[PDB]
Each structure stands twice: as structure tokens, then as C-alpha cells.
Design a protein around this nucleic acid. Structure first.
Lengths: 141, 151, 262, 64
RNA sequence: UUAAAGUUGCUGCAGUUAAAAAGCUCGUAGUUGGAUCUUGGGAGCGGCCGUCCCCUGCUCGGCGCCGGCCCGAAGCGUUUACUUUGAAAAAAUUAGAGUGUUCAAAGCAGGCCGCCUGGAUACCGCAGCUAGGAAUAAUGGAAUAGGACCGCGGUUCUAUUUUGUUG
RNA sequence: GGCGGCGACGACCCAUUCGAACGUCUGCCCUAUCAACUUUCGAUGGUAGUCGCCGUGCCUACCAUGGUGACCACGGGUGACGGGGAAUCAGGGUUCGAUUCCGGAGAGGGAGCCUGAGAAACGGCUACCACAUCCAAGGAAGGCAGCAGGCGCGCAAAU
RNA sequence: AAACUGCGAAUGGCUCAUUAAAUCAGUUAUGGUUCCUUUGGUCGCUCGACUUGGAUAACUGUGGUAAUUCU
């Protein structure tokens, strides 16, 4: 505190309000432009169906290609790119099929060597990818 | 000085046309004056006793009662007729920052012509009444002069 | 709400109705009567929780319209009739009468009385009115309009009325040195003597009441019931005589009773 | 407006440090000495002991 | 979303070089403002001191007496903030007293062989109402004497207890 | 033939009970890329009335130019019903409160009304638009943000 | 049973769209007004027939419309 007076609270409150407004997390969490530009619309999960299966490489130090998928969302038709999570799961996902897609764990940012993408697929055709992985349940066809 | 508007002004408690024996002089032409004690330890002034003004919202010579809250304030403006605006300066407390802030809430009260020795800055007290107007609810009970004005 | 309420929730009931939580959604809303909603006690509540004569809401109705219970000398057939302060209730067949007095805590208490004391009722005058052809009138705290009273009955006195004729027998004047008790607020059921009576023009006139053992407290003017003239009470006081034992002496008395009982 | 209880509380607390050597050794020693099932029991005993200690401290900070 | 964040900083952050003192000055609203006003004493206990009492004025009466004394009171006493007490401040919920639901979350029950009970208490920010003190901070008394006080001197309106019954 | 006991119902008035309603003082999230706003299409007050259960520009006819504002009025936004409360918490705080108790608002959305003590009532009525049922095509009949259930919407919620 | 009369349906239940001194919370006032029901009072206080009148229900009988808690 700098202005310390017995009859000074409105000045302190207004200055604290302005300096709290002039932030990053509070400015993102209390403005509508971020949620308007948010594809999920401030939600944990979203549905979508598959446009096509594409491939993108990694960054400079790591040399591999990561096989994401192109899914557009159902709430508002935003076309995003979601990363198919685990090994060999690109056979299970098909073109024009419903998927359940969630974030990857950095509040809407790219994670590691994958470029730009920030979402992952959790379930395809209302069955989980973990059940298709561990040999516990078979997908309908 | 009186009877300005399109209707007669009178106090509807007394009878102003009593028939005397003579209807001449020596006992007539001194009309009675209606007044009452407003209570709460307040004393009625002489200007409400021997005056000649006619009101219906005066706390002394009128049809309005005094009950509820007794407040105080400083007179700010005397522009609109028969009623004035006072200013109440008070301190507000915040629990987070343990420091006060002053606030003001000005509001309109009623000034009868009994108190005509009023200038800007005089401290007055008011009492709660029934609504006399859209924004007027209080009647002035007494007036207190500020510093200076020794003339 | 477009009209008057007709239901009353269980947790919205007053605490002195002295109920439980996990029994039902609703609580007995009393019929309108002499006493207020938050200051009375329904007949179903008394007969089902205090005297334990009935267990359900139908047994109370059967006992109530069986013409077995008499309320201030008049038989009542309403199960939610408001019973308040010094409401004399009588059972004619088993020969028991109860007087409703607030005990040392904030509640009602069962208090069996003799029938000779059950013939009258002390009640407080509220305001004095003048009738049509110059008849003075009294308004009593349980809404008993009495014609032609004694000329020495003032605003805050207490009169004693026989329940068979409705007339005044004897009265107590509001003055210092009289036995008094409080009806409402933080203090309730304490019996004391009026000492001081502070007059504030335009607001509540607080008084000061001293207990018989050395305690003192201050209550408002409306929270006053005069019950005696001096030290002797005009009615039979409940157990403890309204002394308001504190938590330490209450703990000591309960420990002594537990040790003596074994 | 159903008439139910809707009153419940948690009787145990979880420590902020999940992986420390001395803490896990101490709870394993207590469990193996006194034949308990899991660490939730000693966590709830720590919780009620902390409540009793907090109440005694709150009484001690008030004047005699 | 909260703590960790002393990375929002009122308690409690930083501004030479890591992010950051307006090019400089005046200035209204805001915030903050020096010293100075009653000190010191007495009846006594434990043996100079930590606990006890004393240093606002006036119209009617009950605790006592012989027109004369004390006590009390219809009624008034420079105003604020701050501070302590009191009233009222719905319940449930939060602490919390009691109680072997077999323990616990619960619940307000229950124990002796018709009898005895409990069903407390605290908290409830602020604002409004009250009662002891004025240290702390801000206003005002009189300087053109339209200042207090004391007893006198002139101008007016109204009260039944009376100028032998009644006008 | 005149003359009697206890009740039930109804009734002008008066107080009481249940209240409702209008007012007094104080307290609400963000924003200056909103700095002046209101004002004979009442804004402020006075006189006299109409209406209303009552006070009052609530509304009429006449007068004066008033009223709020950097101590943030006004304007906009709200992923805003308000409170008792919930989570975390050394001390201070931050976030939530649609949700069982209290008060308020609505029954597609505006508008008008009968009855009644109490309704601008919607499991009452009357017209408008959106939507929609049956039919011999002339007409007739309705509003599940009640309990179950169904569709749509969805990450998301039962007989 | 039916039906006339009287009373209740304005209580309860569900939701949070509107609403930022508006709602609401504590504190006051109606000396500025209405109040169903219950409770108590008043109900030969007024100076002037040993019981009056005609309409409708329910019912009987007869009909229309494809159709209604229609007539």
C-alpha cells in the first residue's frame, strides 16, 4: 500500500479494480471475446463428426509425424483439428462418424511437439478408445 | 401580501365569520390563529403564533403530523418555492480496507414561511411526515445559524 | 401471493412450538383468534406432544370434537385453536386443569392447577376506548371487550376476570414494587420486580426489572405482564419460580441430580 | 419440498504431500502395529485430533 | 474455481540497470495537516503502591424531625466519530451442551420399577434506538462589543380566589 | 291461550387475528472507446380539483425554472432473481448462491376484464401475432416454466 | 344419487425470462387506508303477521348439428 489515510478507501478500491483489470487471466476470464473465439464455448467436452484423416509433423527437435483428424463441432460448426491420442487408433476411427472430443490439458493451447492442435478424441461412435485399445469391448458395425 | 392565487386560502379549523353583536370595531378584525405543539421536546416559535401566512403542509399551522425519524442536514440551495434541499454528509465503512469514505445524499425537505431567516449553510433538523410531494417527505422543525453572519 | 397464506412449513414454525424436523413437511398453522401466530400454541401441538394423550392427527380431532375439552369455560371444536398466555384449559372428566405459564427457558410448560384457581384468569389491558353512548371500553390482550370497567384501570394494568360471568373482580396497578414477568424477546419467563421505567418520547419506553436474587435486566413496555402486588404472586408459579439459572448452576444441578439418582 | 436430512460432512483429510518417505513410513508403522485396513482410518483420527486441538487452542487464546 | 500467488500486495509487491516516475511547473475536486485547555490531592485496608469513595445548576415531594435540614422527583442542562453495556435482531445451517442411533454420518431422543427429564448457549457484518468517560481528531462562544451579571426606569396582550346577593 | 333450556345459520357497526399495500434511514457486479442528463409527450415545486381504500404530477388547468452530477448522475453490458447460506481459508480475503426456508416475477408475449374480501387469475374469460388439432369445409376446440412421459437441444440429468 | 343454494379454487406445486437503489435485507410509520374466517361487544336504545308474492332447477315428454363438460 502507498496511499495510507484513514478516509481513503474509494481510491484504493478503484486503483485495485483497475490494476486487477489490467491482467491476463482475469482479463481472459471476464471478457466475452475469448469465449466468442472459443470453439467449445466454455465447455469441457464437445461432439463432432469426422471430415478426413490428415497428418502433421512434429517440431524441430523431435522427428515424427503425428496423425490428427479433422472434426468440425456440432454446436456451432467450427472446423477444428483434433489429435487421435494413442497408437494404432486411426484404424478404429472412420470418415463421417461421430466422435467425442475434449481438450488436451493446457486450457486451450498446444502441448509439446504437436503444432497448433490442442484437442484429443476420447470416444468414437459412442464407445471409448480405451475399450478398443485394451481388448475389453468391440465397436459396432 | 396574501391571497395570491385563484382560490381563497384559509385554515379549516376556525370559523372566520362569527357574528358579533355590533360588527364594528373594538373586538373584531383580529382573526384567531390555529397552532399546535408538535411534541418531541420541540417548542413552537412566535412567527407561527402571530404570523399571517396560510399553509396546509406546515408542521405547526397545518394538517401534517410528526412521527418516525428525526434527521439533520445543511441547507444547500433555496431556488424552488416553499421547499428547500439539504445535504447529509455521512461516513461509510468497508470491511476489507479498514478505512472510511464520506458520502452525501441530498434530498428535498419542506420549509414553511415561518422560518424565513435562512441563508445557505444553516444547519436544520427535519422530521418524517406523510408524502407531501413526489420527492418531499420531511418538514423542518427548527433552524440553526452557521458561523459568522453576526449582522 | 394473491391472498392470505393457508399453509405453514415445519422449519418456518416458531421455535417455542418445540417440534422436530424429520416428521413431516408441514406444521399446524393455527386458526385466527385472540393471539398472534408466533405467540400462541395449537391444541393439537399440546395434546400430541405435551400431554401425550394422542399420537396422530385424527385422534386429536376425535378427542377435540368429542366435547371433552373446555377453553376458558367454553367448549371448542377446532383442533388448531390458538392458546396463549394464561389460557385456562380444563378436562371435565378426569378432573385436571392446566395453566400456561412460560417457564425459566423460552417455551411453555405443563402446570397442573387446582380447580379453585381455574375459575379465574389474569389478563392484561391493552387500550381504553369510549363507546357510542358514552360507554368506556377496555381492550384486553386476548381481545376481550369489557363494558363499564372500574375507573382506576389504566393503560398497562392487569385485571382478574371470573370465567363464569366475564366481570372484573380485582386488579393490579402498574407501579414500581410489583411482581412482573416478561412475555417475549430474549428474556422470557423470568419473575421480577419493576424498579425503573424510562420514558422516551416517540419510541419504546424501556423499563428495568430486578430479580429476587440479585439479577437485573431491561425490557420494552410492550413486553410487560404484571402478575403480583409486591412479593406474593396472584397465581401459582411453575417450578423454580422463574429464576433463570445460568449454565454453570444448571450443570451443577444436573450433576447433583445424576449423582443422587444413581 | 421433501422432508429429508441433507446434512453430511467428511470425517477425514488428505495431506498436501502425497509422496514423502517419513510420512508413509509412519502411517505404515501405525497400520501394521495396530492392525488397521487403510490410511483413511489414521487420516480420520488425525482429523478429529486436529479438531480437538483446534478447539483447545481456541479456548486457550480466550482470556482467563 | 480456491489455496499454493508476498505472481493484485488494506495486513503485504514493485518503478537506476530485469516489465514500469507524466519533459517541467501552476492549479480545482480529493487525501493529509505543528504546539497549546484540570495538574494534583484527602478518609483507609496489604506493607509508597495492582483493586475502594470524594473534588453540571435549578418547579413539586417520603426514610426521618422540631415556619427551619437531608434524601427523591413532572421538566431542561454544547453538539459528533471512537469506545463498553442493553433492547430487538425468523428457523435450518456454523461452533457448541446433553444423549451407547451396536460406532459414525445421523436424529432430538430417552432412563429407572406409574416416576424423572432434555429439546441450552454463542454468533447474526453494517445502519436505526439507548445508557457510564471525554484521552484521541474536526467545528463554536465576545474585538464595530448588538459581551455576561446585578438590582431600577418606559411601551402591550391575558388567567378568578375577593371590594355586602345579583348587572 | 299465553310462558321457558342448550344450539345451528345470517346481520349494520366496533376492536382483535391473518395479513396485504404505500412510504422513512442505510447497504448492490463491470464499464469513460458513456461527461453531462431530464425539461409545455411532467422533468422539479406551489394552488385548486378528478380518480383511487388512503398521502402523492397518479392525472388535469394555471404559475416559477427548477432537479441530479467527478463523493461517477446518465448510458450500456451482465454467462444478474435478492437474502439466510456453500467451497477454500494462519491472519486478511477470493469464488459461487437456478436449487427444498423467506420475499419478489411469470404461465408463448404484450393488452383488457367478469365474479369475489382477496386475481389484471391463465388446470377463468375476451381479441392480436407465432405455432397448431378435428371436419360433411358451414364451423368447433387449446396452451405440462404441475405429476409421469415424448421430441428437439445438447458434455450433461430417473417410474 | 340427482339438482338448487352457500363456501373453496387467489392455497399448494414448477421455473429464473424480466428486473442493478428496481427486488431484497436490517430498522421504522399508517396520527395517511381496506381486511374472508375466528375471538369479544353491540343486536325491545329509533315513537312511526298463528307467516306475504311469482319464477326456475332436479323430473316428464319432444328435437337439431358430423362434432364439445354444446343446448
Amino acid at each position: 500500500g502507498k496511499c495510507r489515510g484513514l478516509r481513503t478507501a474509494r481510491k484504493l478500491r478503484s486503483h485495485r479494480r483497475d490494476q486487477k483489470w489490467h491482467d491476463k487471466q482475469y482479463k481472459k476470464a471476464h471478457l466475452g471475446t475469448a469465449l466468442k473465439a472459443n470453439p467449445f464455448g466454455g465447455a469441457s467436452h464437445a461432439k463432432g463428426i469426422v471430415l478426413e484423416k490428415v497428418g502433421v509433423e512434429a517440431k524441430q527437435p523431435n522427428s515424427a509425424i503425428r496423425k490428427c483428424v479433422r472434426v468440425q463441432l456440432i454446436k456451432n460448426g467450427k472446423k477444428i483439428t483434433a489429435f487421435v491420442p494413442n497408437d494404432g487408433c486411426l484404424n478404429f476411427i472412420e470418415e463421417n462418424d461421430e466422435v467425442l472430443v475434449a481438450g488436451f490439458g493446457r486450457k486451450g493451447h498446444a502441448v509439446g511437439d504437436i503444432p497448433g492442435v490442442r484437442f484429443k478424441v476420447v470416444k468414437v461412435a459412442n464407445v471409448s478408445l480405451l475399450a478398443l485399445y485394451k481388448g475389453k469391448k468391440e465397436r459396432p458395425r | 401580501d396574501i391571497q395570491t392565487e385563484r382560490a381563497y386560502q384559509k385554515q379549516p379549523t376556525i370559523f372566520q365569520n362569527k357574528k358579533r353583536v355590533l360588527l364594528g370595531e373594538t373586538g373584531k378584525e383580529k382573526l384567531p390563529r390555529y397552532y399546535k405543539n408538535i411534541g418531541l421536546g420541540f417548542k413552537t416559535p412566535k412567527e407561527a403564533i402571530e404570523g399571517t401566512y396560510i399553509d396546509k403542509k406546515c408542521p405547526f399551522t397545518g394538517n401534517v403530523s410528526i412521527r418516525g425519524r428525526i434527521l439533520s442536514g445543511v441547507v444547500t440551495k433555496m431556488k424552488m418555492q416553499r421547499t428547500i434541499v439539504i445535504r447529509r454528509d455521512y461516513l461509510h465503512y468497508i470491511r476489507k480496507y479498514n478505512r472510511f469514505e464520506k458520502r452525501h445524499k441530498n434530498m428535498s425537505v419542506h420549509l414553511s414561511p415561518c422560518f424565513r431567516d435562512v441563508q445557505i449553510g444553516d444547519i436544520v433538523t427535519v422530521g418524517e411526515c406523510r408524502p407531501l410531494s413526489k420527492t418531499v417527505r420531511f418538514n423542518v422543525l427548527k433552524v440553526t445559524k452557521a458561523a459568522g453572519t453576526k449582522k | 401471493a394473491r391472498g392470505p397464506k393457508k399453509h405453514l412449513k415445519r422449519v418456518a414454525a416458531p421455535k417455542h412450538w418445540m417440534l422436530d424436523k424429520l416428521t413431516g413437511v408441514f406444521a399446524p398453522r393455527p386458526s385466527t383468534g385472540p393471539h398472534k401466530l408466533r405467540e400462541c400454541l395449537p391444541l393439537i401441538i399440546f395434546l400430541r406432544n405435551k400431554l401425550k394423550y394422542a399420537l396422530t392427527g385424527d385422534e386429536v380431532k376425535k378427542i377435540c370434537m368429542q366435547r371433552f375439552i373446555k377453553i376458558d369455560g367454553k367448549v371448542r371444536a377446532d383442533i388448531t385453536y390458538p392458546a396463549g398466555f394464561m389460557d385456562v384449559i380444563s378436562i371435565d372428566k378426569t378432573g385436571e386443569n392446566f395453566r400456561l405459564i412460560y417457564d425459566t427457558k423460552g417455551r411453555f410448560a405443563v402446570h397442573r392447577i387446582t380447580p379453585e384457581e381455574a375459575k379465574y384468569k389474569l389478563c392484561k389491558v391493552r387500550k381504553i376506548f369510549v363507546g357510542t353512548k358514552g360507554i368506556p371500553h377496555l381492550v384486553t390482550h386476548d381481545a376481550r371487550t369489557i363494558r363499564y370497567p372500574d375507573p382506576l384501570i389504566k393503560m398497562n394494568d392487569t385485571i382478574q376476570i371470573d370465567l363464569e360471568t366475564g366481570k372484573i373482580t380485582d386488579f393490579i396497578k402498574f407501579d414500581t414494587g410489583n411482581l412482573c414477568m416478561v412475555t417475549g424477546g430474549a428474556n422470557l419467563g423470568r419473575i421480577g420486580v419493576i424498579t425503573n421505567r424510562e420514558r422516551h418520547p416517540g419510541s419504546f419506553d424501556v423499563v428495568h426489572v430486578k430479580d429476587a436474587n440479585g439479577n437485573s435486566f431491561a425490557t420494552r413496555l410492550s413486553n410487560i405482564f404484571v402478575i403480583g402486588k409486591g412479593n406474593k404472586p396472584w397465581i401459582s408459579l411453575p417450578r423454580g419460580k422463574g429464576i433463570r439459572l445460568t449454565i454453570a448452576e444448571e450443570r451443577d444441578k444436573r450433576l447433583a441430580a445424576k449423582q443422587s439418582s444413581g | 419440498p421433501v422432508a429429508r436430512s441433507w446434512v453430511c460432512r467428511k470425517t477425514y483429510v488428505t495431506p498436501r504431500r502425497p509422496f514423502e518417505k517419513s510420512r508413509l513410513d509412519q502411517e505404515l508403522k501405525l497400520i501394521g502395529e495396530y492392525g488397521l485396513r487403510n490410511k483413511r482410518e489414521v487420516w480420520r483420527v488425525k482429523f478429529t485430533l486436529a479438531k480437538i486441538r483446534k478447539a483447545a487452542r481456541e479456548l486457550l487464546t480466550l482470556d482467563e
